[PDB]
Amino acid sequence: FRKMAFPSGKVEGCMVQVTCGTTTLNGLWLDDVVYCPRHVICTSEDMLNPNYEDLLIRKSNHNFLVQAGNVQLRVIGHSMQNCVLKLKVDTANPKTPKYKFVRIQPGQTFSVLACYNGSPSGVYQCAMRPNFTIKGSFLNGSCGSVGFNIDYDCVSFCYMHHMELPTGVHAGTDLEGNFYGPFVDRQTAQAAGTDTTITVNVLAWLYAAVINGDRWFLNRFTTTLNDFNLVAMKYNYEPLTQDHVDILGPLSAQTGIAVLDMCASLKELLQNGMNGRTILGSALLEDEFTPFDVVRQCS
Amino acid sequence: SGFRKMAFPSGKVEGCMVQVTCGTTTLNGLWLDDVVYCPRHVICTSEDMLNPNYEDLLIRKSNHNFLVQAGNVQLRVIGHSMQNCVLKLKVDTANPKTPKYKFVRIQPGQTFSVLACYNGSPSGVYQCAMRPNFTIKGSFLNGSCGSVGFNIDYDCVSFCYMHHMELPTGVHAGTDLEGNFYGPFVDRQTAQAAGTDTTITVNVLAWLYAAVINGDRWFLNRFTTTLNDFNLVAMKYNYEPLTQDHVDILGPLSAQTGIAVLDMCASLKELLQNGMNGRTILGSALLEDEFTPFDVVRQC
């Protein structure tokens, strides 16, 4: 059981390099539009209090340099959708796959194609943290890197990297420029919220361990929802909901372990601990596997 | 604050994966130029697997017994040859999406990306390291045989691994693209026991050097040890012995920082005897050993 990322081939052919003045970052080329963060029109000293509306008036089409490998594209017009700059080019991308723009919720997983200057360099699987950030490795030059899921033939684009927070974590928008969490695209002191553990993902991971055969944590006891939340809130675990129980329903059925029975095992691991044991070869409780991920990778 | 283990982008490998069917057995193949490489146990049934006479089985097959599909395009097999534990199927059509490629044989401790495929279709990609017992603990289900491992340097894909067998320990075993197994394993349904898995000491040391470069320094101590003394303690914790070659490879890292290698070795021993004490190193609660020194020296 390892974190598998989606194959990136469909998204690799959509990455381009966008240059405005001295700023160079990554863009997404779909049909005849290049999507990129709007702070590409800003200098490093404009980022204090940027008035993006005035800044876009004073640019023109020739100020943007779109670089598709070695072929240049002519920006034939430009527009702005809340935090994302949409550059209309003269050439349609022949590699455009079946795609959709979606907005995911906290706790959901996706793959990220880390790119630098329009060149893909790595891919990894990650989850939306409950504080609206993501744990990534975007050292420097990876703004405009995108996150995605693949459904049969459809690539669902759900994330675009915009900023790197000083904690180590990173913040970004969806493809419509709506930006996850209480962040703005300004250089100012922005603090990420209080990061909690995705409880429903932990339970799905515990079900995965039972499927593989690691069953030492199973007990005879069962708890209630209301009792479990007090224990979970104390240990900074997201309150489990009834919908969470229904989502874990299919896993609860084959394992034979009810969600509230498995919750009683989780309570023991929270309070007493592993007691010098390992689950799936880990002394730590993993929370970046959604129930759907466990079903995809196991059944 | 954090190394996250990235895999290489898989696009160039995705266009080379095909489906090979012989009888009732279906597995994955690699299509390069005009050859499809795949494990030779595709010509076996479940009965043959305990004691297979591969040359008896292959001598009885014809070209039309091999069905190769690249998506919906049927590939027409015009010849076949066996190189060690791999079958080379010659087809009439060259793969139009063949990248610039190389075949390399890796050593234990080296890392690569694996493209997990199921009956001709890519499913997922992950990064792993060749363990010192010549196995990989990846995520392989039934029907992933023929999935390959690779590294990308500029535009050259280095194919280094092909999945062949799953061991009862839960780990996986395979060959290089020339058909030579990694480790003392055979393509036979017998009691094949993997060796003891040990931590890759040189990889942990390179990762610790990355930590001091970023700013994690709380684990440093004011002692130094000899290589012989360090290895004596290391084997007690199931760590691989450190050689003089490992010390030279870490040399640039010790030059970039101020800490000598044997100085770093004394800190590692202290971590082993005390544990983590609840703190983290590059946002990790465990000593991590799947980062090669070459990667650290690059992505500083």
DSSP A150-213: EETTEEEEEEEEEEE-TTS-EEEE-TTS-BSSS--SSSS--------B-HHHHHHHHHHHHHHT
**For residue A113, what is the enclosing H or E element?**
strand A109-116
CATH annotation of B201-298: 1.10.1840.10
Q: Which residues pair with A124 in a beta bridge?
A: A112
B22 labelled catalytic? no
Rg (CA), chain A: 22
* Total residue count of chain A as it appears in this document: 299
CA A212 distance to own-chain centroid: 27
Partners of B6 on chain A (C-beta within 8 Å) are 114, 121-124, 137
Q: What is the dihedral of CA B10, B12, B13, B19, to 10 degrees?
A: 120
The fold of the A199-298 domain, in CATH, is main proteinase (3clpro) structure, domain 3 (1.10.1840)
**For residue B148, what is the enclosing H or E element?**
strand B148-153
Q: Say yes or no for a CB contact (<8 Å) between B128 and A9.
A: no
Task: Report residue A194 as tokens.
Answer: 């209080």
**In what order do the strands lie in the sheet containing A33-37?**
A71-73, A64-68, A15-20, A23-30, A33-37, A84-89, A75-81
Helix axes B261-274, B201-214, angle to 10 degrees: 100
A42 labelled catalytic? no
Phi-psi category of residue B258: left, alpha or beta, with phi > 0 → left and psi -120 to 50 → alpha: alpha
CATH superfamily of A9-89: Trypsin-like serine proteases (2.40.10.10)
Tell me which residue of B149, B120, B166, B116 sits closest to B28, measured CA to CA.
B120
Q: Say yes or no for a CB contact (<8 Å) between B124 and A9.
A: no
Separation of alpha carbons A3 and B71, rounded Å: 26
Show Cβ contacts of residue A135 under 8 Å, excluding neighbours closer than 6 positions: A126, A129, A168, A169, B2, B4, B283
- Running DSSP on this structure, what letter comes out for residue A6? P
- Running DSSP on this structure, what letter comes out for residue B243? -
Q: Say yes or no for a CB contact (<8 Å) between B10 and A137.
A: no
**For residue A292, what is the enclosing H or E element?**
helix A291-298
A-chain residue closest to B153, CA distance = A121
Task: Identify residues of B whose CB sits under 8 angstroms from chain A CBs.
Answer: 1-12, 14-15, 115-116, 122-126, 128, 137-139, 170, 283, 285-286, 299
Separation of alpha carbons B219 and B269, rounded Å: 10
Amino acid A21 reads G
Q: Method of determination?
A: X-ray
Separation of alpha carbons B297 and B238, rounded Å: 26
Min Cα separation A240/chain B (Å): 26
- Answer yes or no: are the C-beta atoms of B136 and B171 closer than 8 Å: yes
Q: What are phi and psi of B144, to 5 degrees?
A: -95, 0
Alpha-carbon separation of residue B56 from B43, B51, B59, B145, B242 (angstroms): 11, 12, 6, 22, 46
Q: Which residues pair with B149 in a beta bridge?
A: B114, B161
First to last CA, chain A: 12
Residue carrying the six token digits 């405005």: A20
**For residue B90, what is the enclosing H or E element?**
strand B86-91
Show Cβ contacts of residue B92 under 8 Å, excluding neighbours closer than 6 positions: B34, B75, B76, B78
**For residue A88, what is the enclosing H or E element?**
strand A84-89
Could you give the count of Cα atoms lying within 13 Å of A24 in the half-sphere of its Cβ?
Answer: 13
